[PDB]
């Protein structure tokens, strides 16, 4: 009865941008992972630190489900030890990450004839994000010697750029919905067990 709400995470009507990635906390529910096995509609399925087969018979204190949208050329960056605009400025996974990364082509949903520009990504940042950090600040990036007092112009750019998602985009530039499941095991009662 108390099945973990993986449906409202994967089958969510609308997803968030990668800079403002949404996190769902999974606690106090039997974890039915059979929605990942049966659904062959997945393009990228890679796990780290844990194996998916030996996962339905293992308990965890908490499970975190992070979801966002990126393009195909950036899906490879959702992994430990990766660099790039997404890995460094939007969503970073630690080197000892223990979980699974799932993504599928969502060109049918996240594309408009005039270009879907609702999905954004951070372009500049003064430093790289720490693991599992969510930066949504829109401070004007200072790229030159002249300081920006919140105004844009010469070497003063807005930090967020919008994706260009069209139906005729190349596969590398088509939208992909990513779900990142992360598993933690602390010295605390384990509320999430598989079955």
């Amino acid at each position, epitope marked *: 009865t108390n099945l973990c709400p993986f449906g409202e995470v994967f089958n969510a009507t609308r997803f968030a941008s990668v800079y403002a990635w949404n996190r769902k906390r999974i606690s106090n529910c039997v974890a039915d992972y059979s929605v990942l096995y049966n659904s062959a509609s997945f393009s990228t399925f890679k796990c780290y630190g844990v194996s998916p087969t030996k996962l339905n018979d293992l308990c965890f204190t908490n499970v975190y489900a992070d979801s966002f949208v990126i393009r195909g050329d950036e899906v490879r960056q959702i992994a430990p030890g990766q660099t790039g605009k997404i890995a460094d400025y939007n969503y970073k996974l630690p080197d000892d990450f223990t979980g699974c990364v799932i993504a599928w082509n969502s060109n049918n949903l996240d594309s408009k004839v005039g270009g879907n*520009y609702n999905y954004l990504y951070r372009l500049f940042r003064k430093s790289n994000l720490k693991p599992f950090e969510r930066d949504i600040s829109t401070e004007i990036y200072q790229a030159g010697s002249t300081p920006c007092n*919140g105004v844009e112009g010469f070497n003063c750019y807005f930090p967020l750029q919008s994706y260009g998602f069209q139906p005729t985009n190349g596969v590398g530039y088509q939208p992909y919905r990513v779900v990142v499941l992360s598993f933690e095991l602390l010295h605390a009662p384990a509320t999430v067990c598989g079955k």
Partner: nanobody, 125 residues
Framework: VQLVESGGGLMQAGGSLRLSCAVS????????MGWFRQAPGKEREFVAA????????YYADSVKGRFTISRDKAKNTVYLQMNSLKYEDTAVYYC????????????????????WGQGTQVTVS
């Protein structure tokens, strides 16, 4: 997603006029607004644009220093202050809305916007 202009009319040269533009519908999908004008014999030309977030503005060189663009996020309306009106300012002023977020503010001077308003007449005497 509707755009409604108001505030235009006849005005003496050197005077000041304030334009408005109401936005209704997907009001949280606004990335930047922009004012445009087009004389009958000439083509449409960019006037000014402002980013919804932060509020930074970008003006055309013909109106820089005289015109001022602003917006109220709660009311979702972009304003255009038009001080020191010249005879060359006579045109039909359209406001435009877009959901495209460009890191460079100057791109909104040449970017094709999503929705446009019916336009308001501005005549300088």
């Amino acid at each position: 997603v509707q755009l409604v202009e108001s505030g235009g009319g006849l005005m003496q040269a050197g005077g000041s006029l304030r334009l408005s533009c109401a936005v209704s519908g997907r009001t949280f999908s606004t990335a930047a607004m922009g004012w445009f004008r087009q004389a009958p014999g000439k083509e449409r030309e960019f006037v000014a644009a402002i980013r919804w977030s932060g509020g930074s503005a970008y003006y055309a060189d013909s109106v820089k220093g005289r015109f001022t663009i602003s917006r109220d996020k709660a009311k979702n309306t972009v304003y255009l202050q038009m001080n020191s009106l010249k005879y060359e300012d006579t045109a039909v002023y359209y406001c435009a809305q877009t959901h495209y977020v460009s890191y460079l503010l100057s791109d909104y001077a040449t970017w094709p916007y999503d929705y446009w308003g019916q336009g308001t007449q501005v005549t300088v005497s």
